[PDB]
Structure 1
Amino acid sequence: DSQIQFTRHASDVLLNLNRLRSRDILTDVVIVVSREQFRAHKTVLMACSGLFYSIFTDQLKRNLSVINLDPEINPEGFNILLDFMYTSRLNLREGNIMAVMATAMYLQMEHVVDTCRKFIKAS
């Protein structure tokens, strides 16, 4: 009885999911944030966001191929979090950080909000 543990497997899987994303393959939904739209995979959104977990868990809005968020949710803040979801990297500028925390709070991404807090305590 043995077990080979592939230490970069999850990361290779995640990269391949982002590739599909960019080549718009098997994407199965569109998140609308004001005029801007974003194509993505529901499972990925569910894995990372409580909000999305609840949305695609809702028998009603479960099969919709389009979801709309509060119009006050700024697209940049959202796009930074969406990227993060598919790459493990969160890009922050001193001017959009607060916006990001605010946005993540909406998406129910507590850990990311907490990491940002920890960030500000140094920077």
Structure 2
Amino acid sequence: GPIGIPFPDHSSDILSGLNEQRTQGLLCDVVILVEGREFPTHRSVLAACSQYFKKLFTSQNVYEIDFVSAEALTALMDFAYTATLTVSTANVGDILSAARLLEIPAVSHVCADLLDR
């Protein structure tokens, strides 16, 4: 009969490979531009993470985003590609604003819970 063989580290290894690709600018199909900083990424990974980008890409190589800061987009990209959110009580309000406009629920829920109320 069929045997299922699970691979515990597989999804981490796939994400690590996609992160290596943006870091080298290899096989990226899109560039986001925010405050003069370029972010080579994958439209597929952005859409799996952000309902804003999913909507944008399912209806250019370059997309200029004006409604978030470069600092916040950097935190949010690093999270999408590495699974770790780097944040301070100085920039958490900025990260939360951006996560709410880009519609990234994991981030927007954790940031708002830190600040609730």
TM over 0.5: yes
The offset of 1:120, in angstroms, is 3.4
CA distance in 1, matches of 2:112, 2:56: 27
Percent of aligned positions with the same letter in both sequences? 34
| Contact 1:34/1:73 (8 A) holds in 2 | no
Query: Gaps spanning 5+ residues in structure 2: where?
Result: none
The offset of 1:117, in angstroms, is 2.0
Give me the TM-score of the superposition, normalised by structure 1.
0.88
The offset of 1:118, in angstroms, is 2.3
How many residue pairs are counted as aligned between the two chains? 115
The offset of 1:7, in angstroms, is 1.1
Query: What residue number does 2:65 align with?
Result: 69
Query: What residue number does 1:61 align with?
Result: none
CA distance in 2, matches of 1:24, 1:101: 27
Query: What residue number does 2:108 align with?
Result: 113
| Contact 1:77/1:100 (8 A) holds in 2 | yes
Paired AA for residue 30 in structure 2: V
Q: Any idea what SS the aligned residue of 1:81 has?
A: helix
| Contact 1:24/1:39 (8 A) holds in 2 | yes
Deviations 1:82-109 (A, max 9, x none): 0000000000011001100000111111
Paired AA for residue 65 in structure 2: L
